Amino acid sequence: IPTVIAYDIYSRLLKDRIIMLGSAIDDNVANSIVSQLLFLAAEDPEKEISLYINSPGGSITAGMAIYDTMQFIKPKVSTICIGMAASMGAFLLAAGEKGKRYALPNSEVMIHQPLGGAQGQATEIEIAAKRILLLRDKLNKVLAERTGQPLEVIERDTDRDNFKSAEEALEYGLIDKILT
Amino acid sequence: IPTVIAYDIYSRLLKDRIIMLGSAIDDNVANSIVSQLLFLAAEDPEKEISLYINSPGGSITAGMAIYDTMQFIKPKVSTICIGMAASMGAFLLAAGEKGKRYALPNSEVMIHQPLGGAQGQATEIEIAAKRILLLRDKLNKVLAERTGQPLEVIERDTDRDNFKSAEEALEYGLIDKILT
Amino acid sequence: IPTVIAYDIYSRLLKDRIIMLGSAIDDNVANSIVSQLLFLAAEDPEKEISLYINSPGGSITAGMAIYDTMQFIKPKVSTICIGMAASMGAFLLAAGEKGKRYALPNSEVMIHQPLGGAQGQATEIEIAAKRILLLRDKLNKVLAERTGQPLEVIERDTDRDNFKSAEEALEYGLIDKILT
Amino acid sequence: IPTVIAYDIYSRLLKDRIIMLGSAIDDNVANSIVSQLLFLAAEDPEKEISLYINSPGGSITAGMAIYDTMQFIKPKVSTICIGMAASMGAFLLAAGEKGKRYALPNSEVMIHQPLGGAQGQATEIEIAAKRILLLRDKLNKVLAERTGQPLEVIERDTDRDNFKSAEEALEYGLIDKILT
Amino acid sequence: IPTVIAYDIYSRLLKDRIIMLGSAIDDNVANSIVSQLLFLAAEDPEKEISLYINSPGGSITAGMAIYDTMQFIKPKVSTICIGMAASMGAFLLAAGEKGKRYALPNSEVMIHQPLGGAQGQATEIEIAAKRILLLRDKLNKVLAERTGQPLEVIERDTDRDNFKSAEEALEYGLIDKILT
Amino acid sequence: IPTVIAYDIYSRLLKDRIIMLGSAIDDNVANSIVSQLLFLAAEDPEKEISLYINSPGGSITAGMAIYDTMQFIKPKVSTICIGMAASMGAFLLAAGEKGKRYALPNSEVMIHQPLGGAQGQATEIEIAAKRILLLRDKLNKVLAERTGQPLEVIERDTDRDNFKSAEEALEYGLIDKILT
Amino acid sequence: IPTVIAYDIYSRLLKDRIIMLGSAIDDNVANSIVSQLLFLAAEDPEKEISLYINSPGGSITAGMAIYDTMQFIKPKVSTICIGMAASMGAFLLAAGEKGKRYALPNSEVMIHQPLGGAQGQATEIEIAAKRILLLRDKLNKVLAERTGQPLEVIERDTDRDNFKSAEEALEYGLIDKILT
Amino acid sequence: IPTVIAYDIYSRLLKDRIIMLGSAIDDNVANSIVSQLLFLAAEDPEKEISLYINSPGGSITAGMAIYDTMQFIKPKVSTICIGMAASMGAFLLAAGEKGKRYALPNSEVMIHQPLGGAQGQATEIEIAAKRILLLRDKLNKVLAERTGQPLEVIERDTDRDNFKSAEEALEYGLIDKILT
Amino acid sequence: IPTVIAYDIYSRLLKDRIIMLGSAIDDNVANSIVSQLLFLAAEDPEKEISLYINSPGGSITAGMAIYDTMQFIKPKVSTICIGMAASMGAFLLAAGEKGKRYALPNSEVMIHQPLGGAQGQATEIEIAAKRILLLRDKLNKVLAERTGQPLEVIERDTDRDNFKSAEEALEYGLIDKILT
Amino acid sequence: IPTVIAYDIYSRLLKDRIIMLGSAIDDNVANSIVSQLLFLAAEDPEKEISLYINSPGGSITAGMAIYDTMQFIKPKVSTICIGMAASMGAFLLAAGEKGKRYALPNSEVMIHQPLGGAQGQATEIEIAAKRILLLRDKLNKVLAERTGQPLEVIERDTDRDNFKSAEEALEYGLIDKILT
Ligand SMILES: *P(=O)(OC(C)C)OC(C)C
Ligand SMILES: *P(=O)(OC(C)C)OC(C)C
Ligand SMILES: *P(=O)(OC(C)C)OC(C)C
Ligand SMILES: *P(=O)(OC(C)C)OC(C)C
Ligand SMILES: *P(=O)(OC(C)C)OC(C)C
Ligand SMILES: *P(=O)(OC(C)C)OC(C)C
Ligand SMILES: *P(=O)(OC(C)C)OC(C)C
Ligand SMILES: *P(=O)(OC(C)C)OC(C)C
Ligand SMILES: *P(=O)(OC(C)C)OC(C)C
Ligand SMILES: *P(=O)(OC(C)C)OC(C)C
């Protein structure tokens, strides 16, 4: 965590309206990011924001908190995938303002169905199946609207881990432009 | 594990057509009971059999192996509940030959819905939810037959752990005679 | 947790009267939140406070601490559920100023009954049982007042995990508005 | 464990109609003891049986299995406390044939209320509370019958651990003669 | 494991040409069952043999050793599913002599595709992937033959865990008759 | 470990001159097997021996002890691969008397280079490289003579895990006949 | 990590446009280095940047994020290998501006094929194998371009660990000059 | 360890005056081997004893125990190295009756100096050092006598691990003959 | 880690062009030393530098990073051995500018051959053996240059741990002046 | 550790030329202490330094680093024993400027021989033996010089742990005055 004189490198990037997501998305990362987002929007509701995404994914809910603040704030948020955007990573990526979603040449993107668990009485196992199947449905609809694909294609394509090159992700409609 | 003559005390009771179930029901136990059952039926096909039950319960499939074998052989099998017959144990107690299902005066019987778990993709959790709601239903229906209780009442009475004394187990139809 | 010029990102939002709740609720989180609350109330007894909630829930008594401090202070306290507000989290959502309780479109709220444990003599377990049932009722009334639901509906509704979409939470009366 | 000429010391004593309970009572001990009882009752429904008890106690349901069998088989069962009979041990000592319950001069007898545990939802903790309070009451009533004491005195005296010498056990009505 | 007068219960059943497979299939179980199968065939090459199956499944190679020994010997080997026959278990159930494959009414059968792992260099991963797809394809072609179904159906039906009732087992061609 | 009346199943197979190798080969298995081999040869130096091989492999030295006693004793030793013969497994398999080496239809055979480790001074690491490279060479020459293949083919073919069907192993020259 | 008057040593070097990669490359290191690279480019898009490399290597995606950022920015990025540059380390060393890739005289460079794992269903294993062979092929094609070697040479040279001296690095085309 | 009719396989070979050494040499193995040796010597002081050796070696003092018992007894003791005789194992090989020491063609013998440890005060470490050097010399002389090598060659030869083929062990004078 | 003024004591010595190495040499340490070195050379290129060495040794590649950087920069680096310079530490002590390499009167210097490990296929162990015999040789030759000792003598004197006092380190040519 | 106004308590005392050694001596403490010494000698080569010692002792080589520096820098170093100075602590106490070595009335001084360990081959244990016996002798000679005692008396008195009061330390020649 190098310093810039006083700043850590990320808060220095923050000053230029750049947010770095470099890790799995859990409730901590979500909180830091929603907070960076709220702060930037309060500073200049007019200027756009840049979110670099490199990430294996993580919590669906944490994921949606970030997704939802992206849309809810004034600034248009640009997303650049570097390395890998997988899972809730790809989702955040595809959540950039249309035309502003980027990847670098060697990026990967993966999309799949949600993972979870249930332990307990049959009744509690049912409650959890139900919830996760709705989660899977809520995400697919969001993805479909954002990629242009019909819901039933997203369903089939996310059945098992689905890995895409930057071209493939461009063709799929998850990103707009490959940067070079 | 004391010895008798050269037998071991459980084998000596087997000689009398007595099977003792004193542990949770898992695959070894089911394997051992099923073959003590098969053996006795082959020994004398018309001679009735005594199964003492004090068990916390266990696996449903190993439970059903013991159930089906009880029904499948010729000898009438009578079940005595000693101590506690819980869960898949109450199910076996209730599966003894009509009129031959006994409890001792301080026995407990406990009935509830199936317990399980699912991990993984929503697709996989749904597969597991589906199977366990089936197990729950297949079990409830056998139980209503055995007790003579209407199905909808078994579904209500097993929603959460339901502990019955020997008398309530009697008034419920899980046993025939309390013994003295 | 990045810096903003000297500040840390959450402290910069604290200046704007924004509290972030990003984690399970325990004595530590409660103590810090109540502290933030007392501080903001001493700063400008008149100006509104904003509480963003993404939480799995937590300790009932930590929760009530936060709940009572929100009521106790002069500032009206607005709550925004982002991601998930589960359990005591959902309870804190509902405790926001009537008309001022929000969710984002992809938010989940979940309500259920309290969880706990008892180890000991029959007496000590009884002490524990009576107490957890008292807390169940206390909460149920507080929830019924805040949602405008009749007490007996909250009671059948909190029996098992109850997961609601943002539209559904609005219907039930846990939030006043879904935002954009 | 040594061997007498081909037996082992305990099976040897089993020949002479002596049962040795030397450990804590759980499902295994219960099974082996109940099956020794039945074997001996099948061997001679007339001749008395001797149960030596030195035990810390144990599971309530394993203990009842043993209690109920002792009363069920025809042979009269004589109990002797060597060392200590506590909790379920004490209960089993008091359950020997009236006029047949003994102890050696240095024996201890301990009686107390049941121990248990409950985790989970309020509803689950309440079920466990009720079950364990029904157990306490059922044990208390049986103890009152067989000691001759009034139910309300058993309830007070078992509130916390009650340790008694053989004379005190004799004066309470837990045994009949102190042997020498 | 009780004893019968000097045999142990599984051995006395073996004397009747009954083999019990009651556990997961690993190199140990396979070594034991194969060797049981070779002894029975050396006893009476003419007389039929009965394999009872309650198993979670297990190693594909332990499995085939058993499978191939069933075929290699003269005795017609009859399979009975009690409890559950899953995975390599299901495969063996279906490998019994045609017309001799049985299940009890409450039995379950589960078929699925092979499970495994690869850790290493991309080269080693490739070797390991190529080998498991060969196993997959070798198992499917045998299931298609033993059941009657078309390969393309089997391949589609084994994609994820497929749980079947004894009636469904029967309708699919895994077993010939449901016993009572 | 079932019994035959008195024998465990393996010693009963031993009486018919059949040795079962069902596990990884370590110094214990090697010792039991060399010993079974010496015993059989002392009984009837004239009659042939049957060695069933199902095994992941193991210690090279343990492997050679078994190999070397096979050749050294009078009886011709037949080998039958069932399940999998891998590594030192394949080696033992290919060590059967020519014309007497068998597999069953679904068997696998794997051959690879030897695995090992070295930790210490450069000098000790060199000593171990040297030894293992000679081991690799000693085994390849043995394999080559036994399969008919030129040494330099064995070298290349064992570079990385090499898995063979029973046909492939027949074609390679590791076995003589596939049993049916 | 010493301090220099108020900077920490790595930061003061960063002020001179020097970045030190001194560890294994994971999402954290990559996030830090990429973000360092974006800050330097925003400082002076014209002026060159120096990346010192002593690294064991690491994640292929963390690696590419770094690689692709080096290319994406304006500053010509010069690499120096000190100590060792292995694996993704070697790949970055070779990714410096042509004529700007350096090593010190006692440096080592190691290239090899990618390492990974797959656990699961044959289907998941296949997906995982297909993806790693894609990475393999994507890395090789980039190494061939950056070095000058033919793809078929690179593929053959990376089969196992390939260790090279700085002179060998230089002769193979991984670096332009050995510094003194 | 299989049975032979009543015997266990090693005991059946004991009848034929054959001792099997299959494991690392410690106080337990030494005690059993010496015991076998004293027994065979009391049985027929005149007839030869056969000791098969497959061993990694072990405790120096356990080893000497075996060594001295072999010399001490009247029976000539023949040793056969099968697999590996390493360290004290190689030493025991060489201790067989001159002319009677054998190996099989694929056997390895290895010789080296003793291994040990010292923890403590300088004094205690010195005590330990002087002692392990004394054992080195003792062994070196015993080995030099038995191989017919001059003491100073054994000294340079045992400096690091020295691994010999069967041909090589014959040359060095550790064995008299390679068998077939 | 006491502070000075606001520095920390190691930074204050850095201000004097003093680097302290007090730990084993690993990648962090090498990273930190290399950059303290780079920093000082950039600060003043003609001003000589003091490196105190008390270290047990460490990684050879991190060791060589520090070596090469010492040679590569302009300032003359003088090495003072305090306490113990062992292994890669003795190598760095010996790499100080001729005439500028010092020890204190009670210092130790220890030289030995490289330590490492290899696991896996013979092919992989050989690759590792090869590299470490090279490292050993590259190191020996640098060491002979630095000491002025003939190569063949360095190879002899490092065969096993070789501990030299400050005077012997002097007579050997690893240092120039013992200090007082 | 608290802070004086901006220092921390120890750096504060460092200003006044006091060093506090309060823990066991290992490579870290040695580094920090030797560097405090050098800093202070650079600040005022004239003014005396105060080293307070309360330490259990520690590594011999870390201790010598400190010993040698104390004699090397120009400033005269005064040692004060508070609490206990043992092993290397005692050695450091005795190393203060003659006439400047103090202790408080209740201090303990302990002296003993070095502790070490050796594992491995005879050759390796002998190297460790020699090194540690050279160390013992070197420490002994320095202790003899600075106490005024004869070498042979130091050798006897350090054979096992020697605990001394301040008066006894004073009478031995380890210190100069007992302070008050
Ligand atoms: P991922 O983050 O899924 C699991 C890691 C929960 O995103 C999917 C739903 C596209
Ligand atoms: P129990 O044994 O349930 C769980 C322990 C699986 O039996 C029920 C079906 C009554
Ligand atoms: P949750 O936090 O309940 C358990 C997680 C303790 O809130 C409920 C009681 C509304
Ligand atoms: P103990 O057996 O109590 C616990 C050890 C369960 O209790 C008396 C009332 C019989
Ligand atoms: P199962 O036994 O699969 C895994 C448990 C290995 O049988 C399938 C492969 C047909
Ligand atoms: P495997 O047993 O190799 C390793 C498991 C040591 O046999 C090879 C040499 C064919
Ligand atoms: P390395 O970093 O490989 C493994 C450590 C993942 O670089 C290769 C893949 C080119
Ligand atoms: P090995 O058994 O040495 C060590 C393994 C203790 O025999 C040598 C001394 C010949
Ligand atoms: P050391 O640090 O050796 C091992 C600890 C790797 O340095 C030798 C090369 C003198
Ligand atoms: P202590 O420092 O001994 C051990 C703690 C290494 O020894 C005296 C001789 C200085």
Closest CB to F11: pick one of H2, H82, H180.
H2
Q: How many CB atoms lie within 10 A of CB C39?
A: 11
Burial class (CB in 10 A: 0-12, 13-18, 19+), F138: middle
How far apart, in whole angstroms, are the C-alpha atoms of residue H60 and residue H37?
19
Q: How many CB atoms lie within 10 A of CB J145?
A: 12
Q: What is the CA radius of gyration of chain D?
A: 17
Determine phi and psi for E97, rounding to 5 degrees: -50, 135
Say if the Cβ atoms of E1 and B32 lie within 8 Å. yes
How far apart, in whole angstroms, are the C-alpha atoms of residue F54 and residue D166?
65
Which pair of structure tokens corresponds to residue I118? 């290899």
Taking CA atoms only, the protein residue closest to ligand 4 atom 8 is D87
Contact E3, E25 (CB under 8 A): no
Contact A105, A178 (CB under 8 A): yes
- Find which of J125, J137, J154 to mutate to test the H interface (most H CBs within 10 Å of its CB): J125
Which pair of structure tokens corresponds to residue G69? 């950022």
Kindly give the interhelix angle for F122-147 and F60-72, rounded to the nearest 10 degrees: 40
Q: Is C58 in the pocket of ligand 3 (CB under 6 A)?
A: yes
Closest CB to B3: pick one of D8, D35, D127.
D8
| Nearest CA among I66, I57, I78, I75 for reference residue I33 | I66
Q: Is I140 in the pocket of ligand 9 (CB under 6 A)?
A: no
Three-state SS string over chain G comes to: CCEECCEEHHHHHHCCCEEEECCCECHHHHHHHHHHHHHHHHHCCCCCEEEEEEECCECHHHHHHHHHHHHHCCCCEEEEEEEEEECHHHHHHCCCCCCCEEECCCCEEEECCCEEEEEEEHHHHHHHHHHHHHHHHHHHHHHHHHHCCCHHHHHHHCCCCEEEEHHHHHHHCCCCEECC
How far apart, in whole angstroms, are the C-alpha atoms of residue J50 and residue J100?
9
How far apart, in whole angstroms, are the C-alpha atoms of residue A21 and residue G53?
24
Q: How many CB atoms lie within 10 A of CB I153?
A: 13
| Nearest CA among I115, I113, I109 for reference residue I163 | I109
Q: Is I91 in the pocket of ligand 9 (CB under 6 A)?
A: yes
Q: Is E52 in the pocket of ligand 5 (CB under 6 A)?
A: no
| Nearest CA among H23, D129, A94 for reference residue C122 | D129
How far apart, in whole angstroms, are the C-alpha atoms of residue F66 and residue H14?
20
Contact A23, A92 (CB under 8 A): no
Say if the Cβ atoms of C23 and A36 lie within 8 Å. no
Residue D111 forms beta bridges with which residues? D162
Identity (one letter) of the amino acid at I29?
V
Give the count of alpha carbons within 13 A of F85, CB side only: 30
Q: Which residue has the tokens 């077939």?
A: H180
Three-state SS string over chain B comes to: CCEECCEEHHHHHHHCCEEEECCCECHHHHHHHHHHHHHHHHHCCCCCEEEEEEECCECHHHHHHHHHHHHHCCCCEEEEEEEEEECHHHHHHCCCCCCCCEECCCCEEEECCCEEEEEEEHHHHHHHHHHHHHHHHHHHHHHHHHHCCCHHHHHHHCCCCEEEEHHHHHHHCCCCEECC
Q: Ligand 6 pocket: which residues have CB below 6 Å?
A: F 57-58, 60, 63, 87-88, 91, 111-112, 114-115, 139
Point out the catalytic residue in the list A50, A55, A78, A87: A87
Q: Which chains touch J (3 or more CB pairs under 8 A)?
A: H, I
Q: Which residues of B touch A157 (CB under 8 A)?
A: none
How far apart, in whole angstroms, are the C-alpha atoms of residue H164 and residue H180?
19
Identity (one letter) of the amino acid at E45?
P
What are the C-alpha distances in Å from C151 to residues C91, C138, G50?
15, 11, 68
How much helix, strand and coil, in percent to the nearest 5, is found in chain C?
Answer: 45, 25, 30
Q: Is A25 in the pocket of ligand 1 (CB under 6 A)?
A: no
User: Nearest CA of chain J to the CA of H91: how many Å?
Assistant: 17
| Nearest CA among H139, H78, H134, H71 for reference residue H111 | H139
What are the C-alpha distances in Å from H140 to residues B172, H143, H147?
85, 5, 10
Identity (one letter) of the amino acid at A69?
T
Query: Which residues of G does the annotation mark as catalytic?
Result: 87, 112
Helix, strand, or coil here: C7?
Answer: coil
* Count of domains forming chain C: 1
Three-state SS string over chain H comes to: CCECCCCEHHHHHHHCCEEEECCCECHHHHHHHHHHHHHHHHHCCCCCEEEEEEECCECHHHHHHHHHHHHHCCCCEEEEEEEEEECHHHHHHCCCCCCCEEECCCCEEEECCCEEEEEEEHHHHHHHHHHHHHHHHHHHHHHHHHHCCCHHHHHHHCCCCEEECHHHHHHHCCCCEECC
Q: Is D169 in the pocket of ligand 4 (CB under 6 A)?
A: no
How far apart, in whole angstroms, are the C-alpha atoms of residue I146 and residue I137?
14
The alpha carbon torsion through E85, E90, E94, E97 (nearest 10 deg) reads: -50
Three-state SS string over chain I comes to: CCEECCEEHHHHHHHCCEEEECCCECHHHHHHHHHHHHHHHHHCCCCCEEEEEEECCECHHHHHHHHHHHHHCCCCEEEEEEEEEECHHHHHHCCCCCCCCEECCCCEEEECCCEEEEEEEHHHHHHHHHHHHHHHHHHHHHHHHHHCCCHHHHHHHCCCCEEEEHHHHHHHCCCCEECC
Q: Which residues of B touch E52 (CB under 8 A)?
A: 34
Ligand 4: distance of its center to the CA of B56 in Å? 18
Contact E121, G115 (CB under 8 A): yes
Say if the Cβ atoms of B118 and A118 lie within 8 Å. yes
Active site residue A59: no
Assess whether chains F and D touch, using the rule of 3 or more C-beta pairs within 8 angstroms: no
Residue E164 forms beta bridges with which residues? E109
| Nearest CA among G130, G94, G99 for reference residue G114 | G130
Which pair of structure tokens corresponds to residue I136? 């050993």
Helix, strand, or coil here: D111?
Answer: strand
Determine phi and psi for J179, rounding to 5 degrees: -75, 155
Contact H52, H20 (CB under 8 A): yes
Which pair of structure tokens corresponds to residue G127? 């997906």
Domain assignment of residue G150, given as a range:
1-180
Search chain J and give the residue with CA nearest H135. Answer: J122
- Ligand at shortest distance from the CA of H135: 8
Helix, strand, or coil here: D119?
Answer: strand
Give the count of alpha carbons within 13 A of I142, CB side only: 21
**Which residues neighbour A60 within 8 Å (Cβ) at sequence distance 6 or greater?**
A88, A114, A135, A139
- Per-residue DSSP letters for C72-138? HSSS-EEEEEEEEEETHHHHHHTTSPTT-EEE-TT-EEEE---EEEEEEEHHHHHHHHHHHHHHHHH
**Which residues neighbour F120 within 8 Å (Cβ) at sequence distance 6 or greater?**
I115, I116, I117
- Find which of A12, A16, A34 to mutate to test the C interface (most C CBs within 10 Å of its CB): A34
Point out the catalytic residue in the list D59, D78, D87, D107: D87
Closest CB to G122: pick one of E123, E125, E133.
E133
Q: How many CB atoms lie within 10 A of CB G116?
A: 18
Angle at H176 between CA H170 and CA H177, to 5 degrees: 80
Which uninterrupted H or E stretch holds F84?
strand F77-86
Search chain A and give the residue with CA nearest B112. Answer: A121
Which pair of structure tokens corresponds to residue I36? 């303290």
Resolution (angstroms) equals: 2.6
Helix, strand, or coil here: D129?
Answer: helix
Which pair of structure tokens corresponds to residue J2? 């608290």
Angle at B127 between CA B126 and CA B130, to 5 degrees: 80
What are the C-alpha distances in Å from B155 to residues A122, B143, C88, I7?
12, 10, 31, 74
Q: Is A112 in the pocket of ligand 1 (CB under 6 A)?
A: yes
Say if the Cβ atoms of I13 and J38 lie within 8 Å. yes
Contact D100, D75 (CB under 8 A): no
Which atom of ligand 8 approaches the CA of H111 most closely? 10
Q: How many CB atoms lie within 10 A of CB F68?
A: 22
Angle at J28 between CA J26 and CA J30, to 5 degrees: 70
Length of chain C (residues): 180
Q: Read off the CATH number of the domain in which E56 is found.
A: 3.90.226.10
Determine phi and psi for H17, rounding to 5 degrees: 65, 40
How far apart, in whole angstroms, are the C-alpha atoms of residue I94 and residue I146?
6
Active site residue C35: no
What are the C-alpha distances in Å from E22 to residues B11, E32, E62?
20, 12, 15
Residue H18 forms beta bridges with which residues? H50
- Find which of E119, E121, E156 to mutate to test the G interface (most G CBs within 10 Å of its CB): E121
Listed by the residue before each break, gaps in chain F with C–N over 2.5 Å are 5
Which pair of structure tokens corresponds to residue E173? 């061609």
**Which residues neighbour C64 within 8 Å (Cβ) at sequence distance 6 or greater?**
none
